[PDB]
Ligand binder design. Structure first.
Ligand SMILES: [Mg+2]
Ligand SMILES: [Mg+2]
Ligand SMILES: [Mg+2]
Ligand SMILES: [Mg+2]
Ligand SMILES: [Mg+2]
Ligand SMILES: [Mg+2]
Ligand SMILES: [Mg+2]
Ligand SMILES: [Mg+2]
Ligand SMILES: [Mg+2]
Ligand SMILES: [Mg+2]
Ligand SMILES: [Mg+2]
Ligand SMILES: [Mg+2]
Ligand SMILES: [Mg+2]
Ligand SMILES: [Mg+2]
Ligand SMILES: [Mg+2]
Ligand SMILES: [Mg+2]
Ligand SMILES: [Mg+2]
Ligand SMILES: [Mg+2]
Ligand SMILES: [Mg+2]
Ligand SMILES: [Mg+2]
Ligand SMILES: [Mg+2]
Ligand SMILES: [Mg+2]
Ligand SMILES: [Mg+2]
Ligand SMILES: [Mg+2]
Ligand SMILES: [Mg+2]
Ligand SMILES: [Mg+2]
Ligand SMILES: [Mg+2]
Ligand SMILES: [Mg+2]
Ligand SMILES: [Mg+2]
Ligand SMILES: [Mg+2]
Ligand SMILES: [Mg+2]
Ligand SMILES: [Mg+2]
Ligand SMILES: [Mg+2]
Ligand SMILES: [Mg+2]
Ligand SMILES: [Mg+2]
Lengths: 129, 101, 103, 49, 132, 165
RNA sequence: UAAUCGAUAAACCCCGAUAGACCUUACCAACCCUUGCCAAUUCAGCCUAUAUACCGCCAUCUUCAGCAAACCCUAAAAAGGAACAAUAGUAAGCACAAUCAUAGCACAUAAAAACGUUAGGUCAAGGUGUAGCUUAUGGGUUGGAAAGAAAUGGGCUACAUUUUCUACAUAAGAAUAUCCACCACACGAAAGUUUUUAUGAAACUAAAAACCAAAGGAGGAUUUAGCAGUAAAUCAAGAA
């Protein structure tokens, strides 16, 4: 485990939001238990919610050649879990999200939105042209 | 071996439509512009007309990948309903279930 | 030989076969070393062209188009504007006959 | 690419790695088709003769 | 009558795995899924390629392992690597088994240009859920 | 059918305890005083919204990744009255008038670093050209006004005529 | 017409098509090419004949309660086999039922629906048994089709006052088939004709204006569909 300290001022995040998409509920429940218990140990101070499910339904003809009065109806359900972390560092972010991501289940996908804190840019500071 | 001669000619239509693509885009850039002269547009007209019509986008036909069925194709899986249903029913298709509501 | 599953993962990752974490979808693609003002501002290649003519109308729409485009690098955009120079100067007769003197 | 999967698996078959029961059905059936005397004519021979 | 993916009633002697004893309409109720990947979720891409991959993996696993494949093939896809899980009968001696394990892992990692991992679990006789 | 079920076994809570205790060394601390959003605003006014998506398959390339968002409160900018309102009229829809939030969505470039640099570029540019008064700004129509100025009004001349009579 | 195929009583008829200007494309008209897609093969390739040879998918009886191995009885047994103050029947299997889905119940709908029947449907989803084609029943280019004298099934819009216009969302204003010479208008042009515009290499397609305003005045025998948030009416979305 090689650790090194660069003098540069590590990035801050106000809100690290993690979307966990799934088909099944159970896996996301367990994974929630996992991310919660992992973010408690590191004292990351997080919340979790359930964004309402989205269901897509499309229909195919039931027979090879012709009966159009008969249809098969197929379904894809996507269920949500969102982890909301507030007031975290850049390194804490890279580690926690490394640990959370390496173990991510096969049927589930993950979308992360990071709002990162920057003071102001240089040409804007207090010059006027 | 591609499963049909159909899929043969359509594959050659994908290669071709990728090849002359730049030519298409740049010619049709002027041809569809109002500000430019009509005279550059008649010549640009003869120009995209000169290209082999096997390289144009709309001559391409979406088919099922494995079974080649020209119609009844589900865009996202590129699969005919026969084969789609077959695959999803064995549960070989992930997430696809029978709809009840 | 392998001592652990972690040894497996580790070696796959050093080898570059296993993915990089936490994943950035841009890993392995450097985009030629380019920056936005090489993408957004196409003035460089609009230098040689008639300035007040409608050729600037057409080429400013082409420019503003190649600016909005994430799907192409510097190189191919430049090949576009260059093919346009080559073709516009290719026919000197049309431009002049059309009723506007064009350089 | 269908040429890829087709040729690759056929090779792997003759190289004795992959096993195709479909091609074996086909083969055995053309064996019992030609053994019968109705084969696939050598090119150019069938029509005129 | 609905004929999709079903096993008809015999004189009552026909040996049947839990897998083939459940009609398509049971999927996600009782039946799980044979293949697992991100592609059919709400916001995601390239379901088609994971499907082609799936199909060819069926063909490949059934042609590479003659007569010894017990139940239908379980495909997992995680962090770009494929975990291929197969329940397989005991037929051939361990030598040929590891030969084909290494062989398959290599050829599959290299064709699909991504790391493959193969798990075989051996079973004495085909698992029978019903009849018999 | 137990072979298809994801096994959380490797993630069993003992393993999470030990893993997060061996991962205690990589993480870096969070600053005390920043504990409230107020001091976060007084200190760092700007938010940068970055999107990261992971899915399974051979390829890592995600189209939606590139999008960069900037959220800047206009109250935290050094802007003049003239600069602030010329900026409202300049940027427009990117500006929310109730909460005072300015939003820049940047797309056009392949790499996210480039969308970030061009978004902060748009920020600097709009700020530098918000302070430049030009010829046509003295040509300002009174219909263009975000306010009703009592000077040079119609109600003013109605008042002066009513008081004339 | 030189110019596809298939479905065609209930269980065909906006049907395979959740989709033909080229393509799709099987078709016809000419022309061209014969180890003619593949690692190899006296071998490829065949939307050629067989759905009365079949696998796959289905229709239907049917939202019908049964169907079937293992046995056991019947002065013979083709076959049948229950009576609850019970007279020879016991039976695991599979239907139905029960649970699941419709984000809690309950209901409803959805799904489920065995065995067999209709040699019901499809060798054009694909795959094959049998027969055929192999300088052609194969593979390419190019152009060509889909015309109405009718006959009919299904729809959409109506025939107007519970209507029509504009505002508009649910108190408003005007129009209103006969005055009569209106400088015609009340409803009703989705149809035509012009000009645009969408897409496209190619308008035969689609959309919007203007013009035009025709049949139609609630329709013969005879019939469809619906028991509640249904019918009916109004609106949007998606699939390709
Ligand atoms: Mg098309
Ligand atoms: Mg039915
Ligand atoms: Mg016909
Ligand atoms: Mg017929
Ligand atoms: Mg009939
Ligand atoms: Mg019939
Ligand atoms: Mg109908
Ligand atoms: Mg045609
Ligand atoms: Mg033919
Ligand atoms: Mg016949
Ligand atoms: Mg039949
Ligand atoms: Mg028939
Ligand atoms: Mg049949
Ligand atoms: Mg019963
Ligand atoms: Mg029995
Ligand atoms: Mg009996
Ligand atoms: Mg329930
Ligand atoms: Mg009920
Ligand atoms: Mg039902
Ligand atoms: Mg039931
Ligand atoms: Mg029933
Ligand atoms: Mg028949
Ligand atoms: Mg066939
Ligand atoms: Mg055959
Ligand atoms: Mg031919
Ligand atoms: Mg043709
Ligand atoms: Mg009639
Ligand atoms: Mg209606
Ligand atoms: Mg109506
Ligand atoms: Mg009124
Ligand atoms: Mg009209
Ligand atoms: Mg009229
Ligand atoms: Mg009349
Ligand atoms: Mg009646
Ligand atoms: Mg209704």
């Amino acid at each position: 485990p090689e650790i090194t300290i660069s003098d540069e001022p590590d990035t801050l995040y106000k809100r690290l939001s993690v979307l966990v998409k799934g088909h099944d509920k159970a896996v996301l429940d367990s994974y929630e238990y996992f991310a919660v218990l992992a973010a408690k140990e590191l004292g990351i101070s997080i919340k979790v919610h359930e964004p309402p499910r989205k269901i897509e339904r499309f229909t195919l003809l039931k027979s090879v050649h012709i009966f159009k009065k008969h249809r098969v109806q197929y379904e894809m359900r996507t269920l949500y879990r969102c982890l909301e972390l507030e007031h975290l560092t850049g390194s804490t972010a890279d580690v926690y999200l490394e640990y959370i991501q390496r173990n991510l289940p096969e049927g589930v996908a993950m979308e992360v939105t990071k709002t990162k804190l920057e003071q102001l840019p240089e040409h804007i500071r207090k010059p006027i042209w | 071996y591609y499963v049909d001669w159909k899929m043969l000619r359509d594959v050659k239509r994908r290669k071709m439509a990728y090849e002359y693509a730049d030519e298409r885009l740049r010619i049709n850039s002027l041809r569809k512009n109002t500000i430019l002269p009509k005279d550059l547009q008649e010549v640009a007209d003869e120009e995209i007309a000169s290209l082999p019509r096997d390289s144009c986008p709309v001559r391409i036909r979406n088919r099922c990948v494995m079974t080649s069925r020209p119609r009844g194709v589900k865009r996202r899986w590129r699969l005919s309903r026969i084969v789609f249903r077959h695959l999803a029913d064995h549960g070989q298709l992930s997430g696809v279930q029978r709809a009840m509501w | 030989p392998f001592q652990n599953g972690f040894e497996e993962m580790i070696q796959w990752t050093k080898e570059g076969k296993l993915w990089e974490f936490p994943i950035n979808n841009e890993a392995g693609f450097d985009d030629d070393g380019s920056e936005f003002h090489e993408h957004i501002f196409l003035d460089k290649y609009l230098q040689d062209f008639p300035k007040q003519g409608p050729i600037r109308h057409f080429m400013e729409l082409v420019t503003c188009g190649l600016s909005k485009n994430p799907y192409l690098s510097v190189k191919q955009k430049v090949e576009h504007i260059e093919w346009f120079r080559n073709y516009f100067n290719e026919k000197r007769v049309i431009l002049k006959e059309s009723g506007i003197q064009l350089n | 690419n269908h040429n890829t999967y087709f040729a690759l698996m056929g090779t792997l078959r003759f190289l004795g790695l992959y096993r195709d029961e479909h091609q074996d059905f086909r083969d055995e059936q053309l064996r019992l088709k030609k053994l019968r005397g109705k084969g696939k004519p050598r090119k150019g021979e069938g029509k005129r003769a | 009558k609905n004929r999709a993916a079903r096993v008809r009633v015999s004189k009552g002697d026909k040996p049947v795995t839990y897998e083939e004893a459940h009609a398509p309409h049971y999927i996600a109720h009782r039946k799980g899924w044979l293949s697992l990947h991100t592609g059919n979720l709400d916001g995601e891409d390239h379901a088609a390629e994971r499907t082609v991959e799936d199909v060819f993996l069926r063909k490949f696993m059934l042609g590479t392992f003659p007569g010894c494949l017990a139940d239908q093939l379980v495909l997992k896809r995680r962090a770009n690597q494929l975990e291929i899980c197969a329940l397989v009968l005991r037929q051939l001696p361990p030598h040929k088994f590891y030969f084909l394990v290494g062989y398959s892992e290599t050829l599959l990692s290299h064709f699909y240009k991504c790391p493959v991992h193969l798990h075989l679990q051996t079973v004495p006789s085909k698992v029978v859920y019903k009849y018999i | 059918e137990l072979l298809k079920i994801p096994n959380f076994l490797h993630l069993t809570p003992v393993a999470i305890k030990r893993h997060c205790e061996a991962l205690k060394d990589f993480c870096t601390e969070w600053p005390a005083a920043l504990d409230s959003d107020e001091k976060c605003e007084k200190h760092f006014p700007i938010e940068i919204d970055t999107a990261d998506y992971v899915s399974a398959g051979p390829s890592i390339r995600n189209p939606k990744a590139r999008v960069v968002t900037l959220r800047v409160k206009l109250s935290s900018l050094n802007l003049d009255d003239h600069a602030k309102k010329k900026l409202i009229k300049l940027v427009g829809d990117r500006y929310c008038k109730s909460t005072d939030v300015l939003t820049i969505k940047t797309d056009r470039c392949p790499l996210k670093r480039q969308n970030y640099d061009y978004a902060v570029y748009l920020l600097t540019v709009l700020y530098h050209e918000s302070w430049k008064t030009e010829e046509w700004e003295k040509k300002k129509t009174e219909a263009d006004m975000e306010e009703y100025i009592w000077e040079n009004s119609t109600s003013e001349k109605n008042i002066l005529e009513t008081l004339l009579q």
